[PDB]
């Protein structure tokens, strides 16, 4: 898409229709005549484009109105309303821009932001953008949270997010123009190598892949067309429904085999009945000959009864010879069917042990993308976010994805090594109590108008709580926390002196031996300038490999690599790091997933702020004071960086609306 309409698409907005968000702030226009909607839509799409074309410099209201043309630049409050809306919900002047009007000298309102991962950073920078006072409390000694980048000497590798899932309406597109991210396209070629150490042949590769994708659509069919969604009072999961699909294909194969052979028998038995009728005929013909032979032996001249006997027996014997000839005719057609039926047997198996093992790798890849065992994914909803996929290639961040958090963090008040421990929210404000991670005796207290929590969903899930809410979070929020899924996947970075793989293939697989172990080091990545392989650990393997020393883990890597490339081309790696994300106390997992029994609506619950009760009883309803952002709060883009950042923009919009007023809603 291109033009003004392309800016709308690149901002995840329908170019020709008004969103629910805009109906909220412009209920005059969306309820008014169709012509005014078109002006408003043009101003929104125009303004967006101006920001999108050059996101290194703030888009001021004057700049905007100056470059609009009549009839559109005629109404200046419509333009001022649109531009202020966009600035507020972070559709423009978000990220790392140069500001024309430098910052308001004195601020209004104090916000404490728990966590300096990308959602945190992105709100903080927007709230300060809006004239608020922001401090971020971070438990780690670094920013970025789950965007972690290992750096040693000359090696750079991400242990956290490392892929930009396409620039097609991705807000990271804007960020990458603002900060020097060196983005490199990822080539989809992925050759699979079995446990022996040698390539799966191309026919096998296509056969399983197609069966896999067909298997997925079958689960979808079972979901939406057969309402197979609850089994024995428990929600069905993706894994359950893949079993039931595979079982019903194995049952079909037996059913078809059984019907094939039941035609052989029903024909072997027409033949059986036919031969019986012919063995009897030959015996009847044997006797008839002898009778005719004896009648012929009486020499002439005979009386006419004795001539009739020779004539009659001869006729009767020709008749029985017609019959037996008609029957070894029929014996030939049914002998042919038996040969033909026998040569066309149906498929012997549904999948062989070799076929199923490759299938298991395609499942590991699905457990990777969702960081969880397929037995935990909701069958109905696990793919509810797929409608909002970005367009274009996937990319790596060749110089380390941490460059982006670090870039966002400049000019911001960040307390590192500060572990929040208690969040106290009252009708009149909030105090967060944190300790110093190094010596936990030292205790700090932070007073503020509002708390913005970006605590990872895994952290929010701990029992007993790592962070105490005073007063306790309501059941509707704590039940969404239990219902959601927070999964796990880990990486092994291998740092070599020598490029010994295919420099032109970015990723390649290893096929596991068991179902049980389908995720142990099942995928490898060549993304980086320097000689660096990156090995994935997915599925049930993930949570078990964190109990195993780095050497045992690096060992098993070298094993797999030696087999796929020869036992003397694989040297000793110079540097090795093994992530343990479920062990990390500030993560407790890698990212969230739609658990069986959850829906995408739980993600909406996570984003719903918390309003304290009144201090004085019978006092008026207070303001919301506790606000939530982070990857597990944005329904249409969970488990991603871009989703985190969007959630940070979203709360910073809605906090500023609450504490500074929305002058654009009149």
């Amino acid at each position: 898409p291109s033009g003004v309409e392309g800016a709308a698409f690149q901002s995840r907005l329908p170019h020709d229709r008004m969103t629910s968000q805009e109906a909220a702030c412009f209920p005059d226009i969306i309820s008014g005549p169709q012509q005014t909607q078109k002006v408003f839509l043009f101003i929104r799409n125009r303004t967006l484009q101006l920001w999108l074309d050059n996101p290194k410099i703030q888009l001021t209201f004057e700049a905007t109105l100056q470059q609009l043309e009549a009839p559109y630049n005629s109404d200046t409050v419509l333009v001022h309303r649109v531009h202020s809306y966009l600035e507020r919900h972070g559709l423009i002047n978000f990220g790392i821009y140069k500001r024309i009007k430098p910052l308001p000298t004195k601020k209004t309102g104090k916000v404490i932001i728990i966590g300096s991962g990308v959602s945190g950073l992105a709100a903080a920078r927007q709230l300060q953008s809006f004239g608020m006072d922001v401090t971020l409390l971070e438990a780690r000694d670094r920013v970025g949270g789950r965007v972690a980048t290992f750096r040693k000497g000359n090696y750079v590798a991400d242990l956290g997010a490392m892929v930009v899932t396409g620039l097609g309406g991705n807000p990271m597109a804007v960020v990458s123009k603002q900060v020097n991210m060196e983005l490199a396209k990822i080539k989809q070629k992925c050759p699979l190598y079995e446990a022996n150490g040698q390539a799966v042949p191309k026919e096998k590769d296509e056969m399983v892949e197609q069966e896999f994708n067909r298997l997925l659509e079958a689960t979808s069919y079972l979901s939406h067309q057969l309402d197979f969604n609850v089994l024995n009072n428990k929600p069905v999961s993706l894994g359950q429904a893949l079993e039931v699909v595979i079982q019903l294909q194995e049952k079909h194969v037996k059913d078809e085999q059984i019907e094939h052979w039941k035609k052989i028998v029903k024909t072997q038995e027409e033949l059986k009945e036919l031969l019986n009728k012919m063995v009897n005929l030959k015996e009847k013909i044997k006797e008839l000959h002898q009778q005719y032979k004896e009648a012929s032996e009486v020499k002439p001249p005979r009386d006419i009864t004795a001539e009739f006997l020779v004539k009659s027996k001869h006729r009767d014997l020709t008749a029985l010879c017609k019959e037996y000839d008609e029957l070894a005719e029929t014996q030939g057609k049914l002998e042919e069917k038996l040969q033909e039926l026998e040569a066309n047997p149906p498929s012997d198996v549904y999948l062989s042990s070799r076929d199923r093992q490759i299938l298991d790798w395609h499942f590991a890849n699905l457990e990777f993308a969702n960081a969880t065992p397929l037995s935990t994914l909701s069958l109905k909803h696990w793919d509810q976010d797929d409608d909002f996929e970005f367009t274009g290639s996937h990319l790596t961040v060749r110089n380390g994805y941490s460059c982006v958090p670090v870039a966002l963090a400049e000019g911001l008040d960040i307390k590192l090594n500060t572990a929040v421990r208690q969040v106290r929210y009252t009708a009149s404000g909030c105090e967060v109590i944190a300790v110093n991670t190094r010596s936990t005796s030292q205790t700090f207290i932070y007073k503020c108008d509002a708390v913005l929590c970006t605590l990872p969903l895994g952290v929010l899930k701990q029992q007993p709580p790592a962070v105490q809410f005073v007063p306790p979070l309501p059941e509707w929020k704590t039940s969404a926390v239990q219902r959601m899924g927070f999964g796990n996947l880990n990486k092994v970075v291998l740092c070599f002196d020598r490029v010994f793989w295919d420099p032109s293939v970015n990723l390649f697989g290893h096929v596991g031996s068991t179902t049980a172990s389908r995720g142990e080091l099942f995928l490898f990545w060549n993304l980086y300038k320097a000689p660096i392989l990156l090995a994935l650990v997915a599925g049930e393997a993930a949570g078990i490999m964190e109990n195993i020393s780095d050497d045992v883990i690096v060992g098993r890597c070298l094993a797999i690599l030696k087999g796929i490339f020869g036992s003397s081309a694989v040297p000793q790696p110079k540097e090795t790091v093994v992530s343990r994300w479920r062990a990390d106390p500030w993560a407790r997992g890698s990212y969230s997933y739609v658990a069986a029994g959850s829906s995408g609506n739980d993600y909406d619950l996570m984003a719903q702020p918390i309003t304290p009760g009144p201090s004085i009883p019978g006092a008026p309803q207070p303001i919301p004071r506790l606000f939530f952002a982070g990857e597990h709060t944005i329904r249409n883009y969970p488990a991603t960086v871009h989703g985190a950042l969007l959630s940070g923009l979203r709360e910073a919009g809605r906090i500023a609306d609450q504490f500074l007023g929305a002058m654009y809603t009149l």
Partner: protein, 133 residues
């Protein structure tokens, strides 16, 4: 509306595999045993039919009689008439047989005979006598 092609997912079938924990493993053994049972039945008929097939070794070449090529005639030797009556006694109204017995008579001449010679040979009585069999 319909599954991917080749996948076989009927309501009926799905239910019957989810009924209990191993209701899936049960159903898929009641078919392996149903398949071995049919395969052993196929061997049994193959052996039986291999035995009936050796009893017919050589076919009926030894019992075959050569073709009687004889030009059909119109007149009725008394010998031909006597053969006729006696075939009627054996064959009722099967004119093809009677024509085969007499040998040089067309199937119509045979039926024609039934009328001209009928009163003189008591054919009713002959056919009537042949009915009691």
């Amino acid at each position: 509306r319909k599954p991917p092609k080749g996948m076989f997912l009927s309501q009926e079938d799905v239910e019957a595999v989810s009924a209990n924990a191993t209701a899936a493993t049960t159903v898929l053994r009641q078919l392996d045993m149903e398949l071995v049972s049919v395969k052993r039945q196929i061997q049994n008929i193959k052996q039986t039919n291999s035995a009936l097939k050796e009893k017919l070794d050589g076919g009926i070449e030894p019992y075959r009689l050569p073709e009687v090529i004889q030009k059909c005639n119109a007149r009725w030797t008394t010998e031909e008439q006597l053969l006729a009556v006696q075939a009627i006694r054996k064959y009722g109204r099967d004119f093809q047989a009677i024509s085969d017995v007499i040998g040089n008579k067309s199937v119509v001449q045979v039926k024609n005979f039934f009328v001209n010679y009928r009163r003189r040979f008591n054919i009713d009585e002959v056919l009537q006598e042949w009915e009691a069999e």
